[PDB]
Amino acid sequence: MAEFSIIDQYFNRQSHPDVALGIGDDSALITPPPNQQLVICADTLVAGRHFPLETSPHAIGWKSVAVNLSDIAAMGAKPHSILLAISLPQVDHEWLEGFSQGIYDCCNQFGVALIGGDTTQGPHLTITVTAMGWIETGKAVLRSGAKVGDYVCVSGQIGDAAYGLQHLGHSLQQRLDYPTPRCKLGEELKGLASSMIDVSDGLAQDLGHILKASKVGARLILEKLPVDPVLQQIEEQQRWQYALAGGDDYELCFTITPQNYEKLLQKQLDVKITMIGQIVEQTKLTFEHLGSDYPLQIHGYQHFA
Amino acid sequence: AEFSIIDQYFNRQSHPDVALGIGDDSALITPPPNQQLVICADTLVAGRHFPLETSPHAIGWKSVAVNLSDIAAMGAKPHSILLAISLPQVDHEWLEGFSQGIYDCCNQFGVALIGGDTTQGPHLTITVTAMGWIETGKAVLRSGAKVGDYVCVSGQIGDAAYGLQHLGHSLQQRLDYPTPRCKLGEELKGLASSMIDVSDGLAQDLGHILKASKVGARLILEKLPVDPVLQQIEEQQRWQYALAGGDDYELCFTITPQNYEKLLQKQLDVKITMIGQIVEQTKLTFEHLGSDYPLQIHGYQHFA
Ligand SMILES: Nc1ncnc2c1ncn2[C@@H]1O[C@H](COP(=O)(O)OP(=O)(O)O)[C@@H](O)[C@H]1O
Ligand SMILES: Nc1ncnc2c1ncn2[C@@H]1O[C@H](COP(=O)(O)OP(=O)(O)O)[C@@H](O)[C@H]1O
Ligand SMILES: Cc1ncc(C[n+]2csc(CCOP(=O)(O)OP(=O)(O)O)c2C)c(N)n1
Ligand SMILES: Cc1ncc(C[n+]2csc(CCOP(=O)(O)OP(=O)(O)O)c2C)c(N)n1
Numbered sequence: 001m002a003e004f005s006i007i008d009q010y011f012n013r014q015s016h017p018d019v020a021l022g023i024g025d026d027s028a029l030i031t032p033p034p035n036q037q038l039v040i041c042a043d044t045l046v047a048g049r050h051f052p053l054e055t056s057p058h059a060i061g062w063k064s065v066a067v068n069l070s071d072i073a074a075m076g077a078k079p080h081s082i083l084l085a086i087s088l089p090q091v092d093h094e095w096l097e098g099f100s101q102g103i104y105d106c107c108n109q110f111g112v113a114l115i116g117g118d119t120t121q122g123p124h125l126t127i128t129v130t131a132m133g134w135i136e137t138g139k140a141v142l143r144s145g146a147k148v149g150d151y152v153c154v155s156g157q158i159g160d161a162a163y164g165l166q167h168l169g170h171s172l173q174q175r176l177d178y179p180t181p182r183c184k185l186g187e188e189l190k191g192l193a194s195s196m197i198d199v200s201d202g203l204a205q206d207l208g209h210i211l212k213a214s215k216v217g218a219r220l221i222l223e224k225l226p227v228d229p230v231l232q233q234i235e236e237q238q239r240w241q242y243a244l245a246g247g248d249d250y251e252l253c254f255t256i257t258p259q260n261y262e263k264l265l266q267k268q269l270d271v272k273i274t275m276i277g278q279i280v281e282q283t284k285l286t287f288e289h290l291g292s293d294y295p296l297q298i299h300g301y302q303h304f305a
Numbered sequence: 306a307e308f309s310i311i312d313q314y315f316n317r318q319s320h321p322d323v324a325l326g327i328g329d330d331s332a333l334i335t336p337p338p339n340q341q342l343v344i345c346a347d348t349l350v351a352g353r354h355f356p357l358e359t360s361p362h363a364i365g366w367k368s369v370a371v372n373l374s375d376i377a378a379m380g381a382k383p384h385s386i387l388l389a390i391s392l393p394q395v396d397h398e399w400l401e402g403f404s405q406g407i408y409d410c411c412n413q414f415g416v417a418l419i420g421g422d423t424t425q426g427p428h429l430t431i432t433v434t435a436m437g438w439i440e441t442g443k444a445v446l447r448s449g450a451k452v453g454d455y456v457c458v459s460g461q462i463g464d465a466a467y468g469l470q471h472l473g474h475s476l477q478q479r480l481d482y483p484t485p486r487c488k489l490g491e492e493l494k495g496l497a498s499s500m501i502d503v504s505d506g507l508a509q510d511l512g513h514i515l516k517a518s519k520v521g522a523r524l525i526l527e528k529l530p531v532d533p534v535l536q537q538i539e540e541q542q543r544w545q546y547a548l549a550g551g552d553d554y555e556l557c558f559t560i561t562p563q564n565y566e567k568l569l570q571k572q573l574d575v576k577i578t579m580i581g582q583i584v585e586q587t588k589l590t591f592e593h594l595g596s597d598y599p600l601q602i603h604g605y606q607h608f609a
């Protein structure tokens with residue numbers, strides 16, 4: 001099987017009648033919802049860098065979509081559609097079947113259409129998904145906007161995926177392979193969060209982008225960081241390195257006034273939310289453990305580091 | 306370091322019509338009224354889409370150009386791009402040239418670079434996403450061709466294919482620096498009945514129109530616009546370059562005789578050639594000096 005047959009078999013599997021023009025032409029066409037801005041992002045996953053080489057193709061497909069929906073969610077936007085650019089060295093039908101099932105399972109979970117892409121023979125498995133969302137004009141939640149006194153919160157748990165990576169085969173590998181983009185939470189934070197970012201690199205570094213953009217700092221409370229029971233039972237310095245510098249969480253970190261936090265707590269959310277600290281004037285990220293200053297060195301993720 | 310790379314090479318310019326550009330989790334664009342989003346992505350792989358020794362400036366240029374070509378093929382006005390680049394090492398001479406190529410192409414066509422992703426990976430792989438806008442319902446589709454419509458192509462076909470087989474020749478410029486026919490694409494909006502850009506080869510790419518439109522075509526071989534260099538090579542190889550060479554990134558379109566006259570009255574920035582006609586029976590046939598002319602043609606396909 002060659003390119004065109006591969007696209008028709010694996011990447012044109014569903015009807016999306018609410019899309020003006022899907023797969024089959026030089027470009028896709030989307031009629032915007034009225035009074036909304038386009039929200040758009042792209043993230044690349046490289047085999048052996050963003051996932052273990054032995055990762056199941058279904059997980060690879062899932063995560064390729066999920067990490068991009070996470071950046072849409074981080075703006076407060078509603079995700080709509082994706083493009084899929086996949087480059088791989090050989091036609092492997094078992095692999096293509098699993099991969100495309102992963103793409104579509106993630107798309108279907110979050111109501112997203114696959115409307116276009118590019119299919120390429122290349123020496124090393126590389127996937128770039130583009131995600132498209134829409135938001136009420138002017139209402140995006142930015143990385144700027146955090147104010148002194150705002151609570152710092154994070155969704156779900158942090159550190160799971162990083163622990164999983166260092167313990168392949170452990171149950172927590174599921175959080176590495178199958179992160180959950182917090183799509184509904186992102187939408188529910190529109191109008192409530194004063195700033196937001198998704199946690200791809202590690203809580204400390206990604207919160208750091210908010211702190212820099214907003215020209216503020218934060219004090220975080222280590223015993224409040226939401227970690228898995230498994231990490232609660234390991235050495236605390238190791239625990240907090242996973243939680244704060246592990247990365248691969250794809251949770252949402254956001255700031256919010258006490259006032260708006262009470263409003264948020266009144267909503268029915270599909271993920272837990274944990275208040276983990278507060279924005280301060282001092283432009284430094286500091287940590288405390290049960291009332292005591294806690295010195296902590298955190299190495300962040302960067303390509304070519 | 307990744308962050309300094311983005312700031313030095315890929316965040317070089319300010320852009321008038323972008324609600325939110327580089328620096329956040331996503332970019333934000335305010336649509337023009339009564340217009341649809343037109344969106345596409347194309348990947349270039351080193352050693353597959355370009356010779357390994359290709360200059361970084363040409364790699365950057367072509368990375369953008371091929372994506373603007375797909376926007377143009379819809380009749381749409383390009384607006385912005387995303388750049389996803391994966392590469393094994395930081396090479397500042399390479400990155401400077403590559404960036405300059407990206408921005409030279411963007412600037413020539415009034416396009417903003419508004420986001421992307423920068424990655425360390427074993428093999429140079431570039432995926433640009435292009436975004437444009439078009440009056441709702443006025444996209445030129447592959448599916449609109451009608452019996453009796455003229456078949457036309459812009460510019461020259463076969464140049465880039467010849468250039469690849471004769472690296473160092475002047476025609477290598479058409480391999481390294483294809484020209485996306487942005488203005489012609491826009492001017493065909495409301496005139497062309499169907500359109501496609503010729504990335505794979507005229508015969509195969511016209512074929513996509515024929516299949517989508519459920520029609521056939523008869524092409525006139527002596528009318529194909531080839532370079533003077535190709536007129537000098539024996540005709541079988543000439544036809545193969547012209548029809549199956551690929552990498553042209555010209556526009557192939559169908560148009561009624563009446564609308565063709567209207568098109569001719571416009572001032573275009575590129576040559577246009579009538580090369581045949583849409584017919585009822587659903588096959589592609591070639592004609593040479595008034596006679597049917599059998600040709601075996603294979604357009605480009607990955608994994609074939
Ligand atoms: N992996 C993929 N997933 C979804 N759509 C895809 C994929 N690969 C290609 N497509 C779509 O299939 C169609 C044909 O792609 P392609 O032949 O590469 O177009 P072009 O030659 O105009 O770039 C396009 O509409 C493209 O968006
Ligand atoms: N090569 C590039 N060209 C243009 N913009 C880029 C490029 N790489 C990254 N960006 C932009 O730089 C910002 C930071 O990117 P990144 O740190 O990867 O964000 P995230 O962690 O949210 O995915 C984003 O706004 C992204 O779109
Ligand atoms: C094999 C393997 N090694 C290491 C990691 C850990 N890892 C890879 S990329 C990354 C950070 C997130 O990737 P990045 O490209 O920076 O995401 P983005 O900021 O673009 O969303 C981490 C922690 C992994 N998941 N798999
Ligand atoms: C080193 C090298 N080998 C071969 C070619 C020729 N070539 C590579 S890809 C291609 C077809 C166009 O690429 P494709 O990915 O199919 O473009 P798309 O249809 O996605 O726009 C051709 C003719 C080249 N340009 N460089």
Ligand SMILES: [Ca+2]
Pocket residue numbers: 043044422423424
């Ligand atoms: Ca990335």
Ligand SMILES: [Ca+2]
Pocket residue numbers: 043067068071200
């Ligand atoms: Ca991301």
Ligand SMILES: [Ca+2]
Pocket residue numbers: 200201301302
């Ligand atoms: Ca990162």
Ligand SMILES: [Ca+2]
Pocket residue numbers: 118119120347348
């Ligand atoms: Ca391609």
Ligand SMILES: [Ca+2]
Pocket residue numbers: 347371372375504
């Ligand atoms: Ca293309």
Ligand SMILES: [Ca+2]
Pocket residue numbers: 504505605606
């Ligand atoms: Ca092709």
Ligand SMILES: [Mg+2]
Pocket residue numbers: 025026374375378501502503504
């Ligand atoms: Mg095309």
Ligand SMILES: [Mg+2]
Pocket residue numbers: 117118119346347348
């Ligand atoms: Mg393509």
Ligand SMILES: [Mg+2]
Pocket residue numbers: 070071074197198199200329330
């Ligand atoms: Mg992000």
Ligand SMILES: [Mg+2]
Pocket residue numbers: 042043044421422423
């Ligand atoms: Mg990124």
Ligand code: NA
Pocket residue numbers: 041042043071330421422
């Ligand atoms: Na991204």
Ligand code: NA
Pocket residue numbers: 026117118345346347375
């Ligand atoms: Na494309």
